[PDB]
Design a protein around this nucleic acid. Structure first.
Lengths: 50, 138, 96, 186, 188, 141, 71
RNA sequence: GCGAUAACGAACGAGACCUUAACCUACUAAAUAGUGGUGCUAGCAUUUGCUGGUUAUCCACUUCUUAGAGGGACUAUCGGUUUCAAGCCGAUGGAAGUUUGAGGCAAUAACAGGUCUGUAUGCCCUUAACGUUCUGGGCCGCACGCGCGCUACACUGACGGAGCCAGCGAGUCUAACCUUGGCCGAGAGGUCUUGGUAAUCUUGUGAAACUCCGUCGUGCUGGGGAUAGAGCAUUGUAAUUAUUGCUCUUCAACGAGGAAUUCCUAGUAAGCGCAAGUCAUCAGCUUGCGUUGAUUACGUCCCUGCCCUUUGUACACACC
């Protein structure tokens, strides 16, 4: 998958989540979060960000 | 000097009212030049309303930012009116409140009080905007 | 102008540190242009509470109310050094 | 009062007596009447009743896209046309037409399934204004669409046929329709 | 402040929490306060027993502060660490929720869990103590058992009441089972 | 008077008449390859053939705003989301018009270059504006 | 298109062409699903085998075509 | 909420606390604008003077915005109705009325409601492989049906030129946003230089609706736009499959839509632009914003959902 730091071309190794493997529209500001899903969960944990 | 405020639909009408001269300066250009279109009789409106005519009488210098040709012509107007009641003569100027209330008379969305209107969108659930739905007797 | 800026979480820690700079740093040898308020360095947004999935009918408004004060110190003489005495209230992020 | 700093109501004769009491030319409800222009064409006539309610029904029906910004040019620029054509006050001619297009007694509908129960209700002044202007504009917007005619010429021609009385007019004809069914099913 | 990288310091707080959930478990975990000075976090960890956190001549407090800076997924900083005591046991909901779940795991039933702990909290002080035990009540099917002492049933008004909140889990042969505990102290 | 007293459109037309008299401003021949290849008939005010009417507009904007940039007299300053933006990358149709116009006006002494980037408007410039503004104002009254 | 300053000719197929051309023209279609290459004069003759999706549809590469990509 | 009453007091909800918009004000004031102390640049004019745009440092004066804080609206005050109750109805005062507008709050429980693809996790399983890696092709297929958005059938206007105007939000910490100056050149497009901004600058008055005036004159057109073919980039490896877009050229369906059906309750739909979110890179979507802004309730008969009392029951695995 993506987490190997040498893809073939520049743009292959895209973005992935840390928590899940999931891919489908992540966040630039926080490289974690499934897609949208842990954005509101980890807001309810502590703090917020835009 | 005597100054005052007066906004509608977002505006900052910084209307100075002063004795001597009677040129209407809007920012850094005269009245006819800033507003060349059709609605610019409104900025000349509360001037002649008080009884006597202007140009001979009182000097007006406004600054204004914020507001379209629909908004600005009321913002400047409202500030000239709100600064009229706060002005000084010899009898003085407080009861011109009632005659600026009698400007747009008997359905009082006047020139003493503001057009408290900020045109934002259209609503969900029935038919809606401002002035409530469904009446035979309207 | 020697630009000091303060920013913290809420009001309670902010009042003490702001007033202390007027008391401690300022005296006679310092003239400040003074202790101002300013708008908050806030970031608000309305989004949905459930993050996508079941329920479009759910909402949650958010903010990050991070209350800034500027409080600028004008005269750059001897007394601009004595700010090192106040180190109280962590949670206040001092930035110079 | 003075409408576009020339024409007033002091040079205007009023027809219907109960509309004097209720609708006042001060501001509630403003008895100055004029509409019928789009683009640049000086046709003939003018006329459309109560300027406060030309912000109302006349706006949305049109026929025009755009709201009040359109409407204020429709109102303003037609004033000069009737002034040199019939040589009248643009308000006076359609103070005749407003009572002809406004019913005295109307009918409500209530829908009990697929049954239209038209029963009589009384009107009197206030509703007669806006429902009449609704009758003018619905006939005008459809007559601009369905045959080659702009909203300028449609609104203009209509109201002398409405004022005097003709079956060419939409608004006096639908006033008749709604009024006579009330006095029948009463 | 921090306009720029919030995903620098923000993720470091989470890494620190994952340390003391595992490490400071038996010593009696409650929470850590991490006030940030530039390149120095506070890391005032709060244990019920601080005698073990220090250890024999302060060996374990030296161990913890070294390992939380570097082992796997940690930033250095050159930070400090302080071992502070939790005052009482009953008033803290995070400390009580931990001990309730240990009893459930061990082999004590849900009624001899809930009724025993609410009495202890009302004895030390508090205002109300709600102990809602969800999941499989002594092995069964899912649902809740509430039961509370005092004024603490569904918050008990918003205002100012100072409610300590907690959630804790159990792994057991049966299934994963949780608990939600609220303990109200005094209006503040 | 000043350029404010006279109207917007008709000043640009009036000034354009005197602009054609001065033989520093030539047509490099761009807009005769657009308006004819269209269908568009534009009568003599609207017409613009072309460097005369466009120079009168551009020079009026250095009275009305005055601060620097050939680029900030090309497109107003930023917003060329209408019609086509061009800032860093190689300049297009709009580019080769306005770099030429302020170059040609400089060979008169209408515009000068001020040291914080680009253009201002100088002595013979505002003479050639507001003196013509007076003549038009006398025809308006 | 990439013409000025480095045209996008993928270096693996230059190694293919220098091998297969000076021997004998290979009458079997060599599969070459690489789309992103500039076509060069040492590819003339030999049947290159770009995929489409469900099928293939035989190349005869002519000396007139050179300038484009495989497109 | 007020009367009546074998009850009297109280708790969890809800009306308030909190957050945001409407407005006033003393005191301390940051960034911005204007004006003066020295202005600076320039015109028009014989001169006096009058007119325009720009902008720093220190101080003064005038202003605008926010936040610490102090208030304001309570059916308070007045008239009519009602048992001279509670309430309604309208009016006065004001920037603002009957919890002011919009968020935030979701009781007790049920639907064995949905999520084992977020993580956590009982147990079942599979393990030279329902593991892992390489690359291509698929997810864009198709011969029809259904649901939701976008755009048009127009003078409701189109086309050309000129002109006036808003608000919410973004922008490296060592790959930013962007002003400038010249050079390739049919487009999508950055190496380099200079200047501002950490948000004072910049995206944004090259911001539409709209307005002025002229032309077309109701014809598949000057309507509408799918589709195809024809000229390129010192980088984003690179856009046949599968990118948007710019000029010439191609100029369809369509000329207001049956049975039937949905949404739109007073600045929060229509109509109209503008900005954010994911993002190396593909919006008509999602999310947020301002500008211009109204037709219509007499009345609950019928329809659908929900609440209370009374009422019939053989109904009870949840009342299929």
């Amino acid at each position: 998958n993506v987490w190997f730091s040498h893809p073939r071309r520049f743009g292959k190794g895209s973005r992935q989540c840390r928590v899940c493997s999931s891919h489908t529209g992540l966040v630039r500001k926080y490289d974690l979060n499934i897609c949208r899903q842990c954005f509101r969960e980890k807001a309810n944990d502590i703090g917020f960000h835009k | 000097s005597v100054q005052t405020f007066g906004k509608k639909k977002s505006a900052t009408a910084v209307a100075h009212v002063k004795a001597g001269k009677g040129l209407i300066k809007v920012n850094g250009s005269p009245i006819t030049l800033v507003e060349p279109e059709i609605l610019r009789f409104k900025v000349y409106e509360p001037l002649l309303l008080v009884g006597l005519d202007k140009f001979s009488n009182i000097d007006i210098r406004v600054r204004v930012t914020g507001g379209g040709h629909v908004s600005q012509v009321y913002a400047i107007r409202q500030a000239i009116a709100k600064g009229l009641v706060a002005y000084h003569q010899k009898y003085v100027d407080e009861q011109s409140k009632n005659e600026l209330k009698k400007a747009f008379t008997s359905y009082d969305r006047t020139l003493l009080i503001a057009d408290s209107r900020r045109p934002e969108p259209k609503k969900f659930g029935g038919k809606g905007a401002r002035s409530r739905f469904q009446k035979s007797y309207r | 102008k020697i630009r000091i800026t303060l920013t913290s979480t809420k009001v309670k820690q902010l009042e003490n540190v702001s007033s202390n700079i007027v008391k401690n740093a300022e005296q006679h040898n310092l003239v400040k242009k003074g202790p101002v308020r300013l708008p908050t360095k806030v970031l608000k947004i309305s989004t949905r509470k459930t993050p996508n999935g079941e329920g479009s009918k759910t909402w949650e408004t958010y903010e990050m109310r991070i209350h800034k004060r500027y409080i600028d110190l004008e005269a750059p003489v001897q007394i601009v050094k004595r700010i090192t005495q106040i180190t109280i209230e962590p949670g206040v992020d001092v930035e110079v | 009062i003075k409408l576009f700093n020339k024409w007033s109501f002091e040079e205007v004769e009023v027809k219907d007596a109960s509309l004097v009491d209720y609708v006042q030319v001060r501001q509630p409800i403003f008895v100055a009447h004029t509409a019928g222009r789009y683009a640049n064409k000086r046709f003939r006539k003018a006329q459309c009743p109560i300027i406060e309610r030309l912000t109302n029904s006349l706006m949305m029906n049109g026929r025009n896209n755009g709201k009040k910004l359109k409407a204020v040019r429709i109102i303003k620029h037609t004033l000069d046309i009737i002034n040199v054509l019939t040589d009248q006050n643009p308000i006076q001619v359609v103070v005749d037409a407003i009572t002809n297009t406004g019913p005295r007694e109307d009918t409500t509908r209530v829908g009990g399934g697929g049954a239209a129960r038209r029963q009589a209700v009384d009107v009197s002044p206030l509703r007669r204004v806006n429902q009449a202007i609704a009758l003018l504009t619905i006939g005008a917007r459809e007559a601009a669409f369905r045959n080659i005619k702009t909203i300028a010429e449609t609104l203009a021609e209509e109201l002398i046929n409405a004022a005097k009385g003709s079956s060419t007019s939409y608004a006096i004809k639908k006033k008749d329709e709604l009024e006579r069914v009330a006095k029948s099913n009463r | 402040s921090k306009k720029r990288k919030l995903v620098a310091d923000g993720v470091f707080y989470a890494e620190l929490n994952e340390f003391f959930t595992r490490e400071l478990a038996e010593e009696g975990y409650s929470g850590v306060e991490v006030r940030v000075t530039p390149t120095k976090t506070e890391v005032i960890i709060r244990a019920t027993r601080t005698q073990d956190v220090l250890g024999e001549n302060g060996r374990r407090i030296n161990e913890l502060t070294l390992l939380v800076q570097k082992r796997f997924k940690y930033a250095p900083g050159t930070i400090v660490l302080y071992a502070e005591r939790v005052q009482d046991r009953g008033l803290s909901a995070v400390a009580q929720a931990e001990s309730m779940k240990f009893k459930l795991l061990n082999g004590l039933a849900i009624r001899r869990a809930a009724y025993g702990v609410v009495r202890y909290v009302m004895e030390s002080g508090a205002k109300g103590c709600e102990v809602v035990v969800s999941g499989k009540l002594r092995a069964a099917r899912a649902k809740a058992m509430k039961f509370a002492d005092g004024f603490l049933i569904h918050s008990g008004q918003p205002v100012n009441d100072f409610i300590d909140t907690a959630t804790r889990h159990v792994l057991m042969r049966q299934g994963v089972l949780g608990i939600k505990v609220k303990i109200m102290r005094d209006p503040a | 008077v000043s350029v404010r007293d006279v109207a917007a459109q008709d000043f640009i037309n009036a000034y354009a008449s005197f602009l054609q008299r001065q033989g520093k401003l030539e047509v490099p021949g761009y807009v005769d390859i657009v308006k004819t290849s269209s269908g568009n008939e534009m009568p003599p005010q609207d017409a613009e053939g072309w460097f005369y009417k466009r120079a009168a507009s551009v020079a009026r904007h250095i009275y009305m705003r005055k601060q620097v940039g050939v680029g900030k007299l090309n497109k107003l300053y930023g917003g060329a989301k209408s019609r086509g933006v061009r800032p860093y990358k190689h300049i297009d149709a709009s580019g080769s018009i306005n770099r030429k116009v302020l170059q040609a006006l400089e060979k008169i002494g209408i515009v000068e270059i001020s040291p914080k980037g680009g253009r201002r408007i100088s002595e013979n410039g505002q003479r050639d504006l507001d003196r013509i503004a007076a003549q038009t104002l006398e025809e308006d009254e | 298109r990439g013409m000025t300053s480095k045209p996008a000719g993928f270096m693996k197929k230059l190694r293919a062409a220098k091998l297969a051309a000076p021997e004998n023209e290979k009458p079997a279609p060599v599969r070459t699903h690489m789309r992103n290459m500039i076509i060069v004069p040492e590819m003339i003759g030999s049947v290159v085998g770009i995929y489409n999706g469900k099928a293939f549809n035989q190349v005869e590469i002519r000396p007139e075509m050179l300038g484009h990509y495989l497109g």
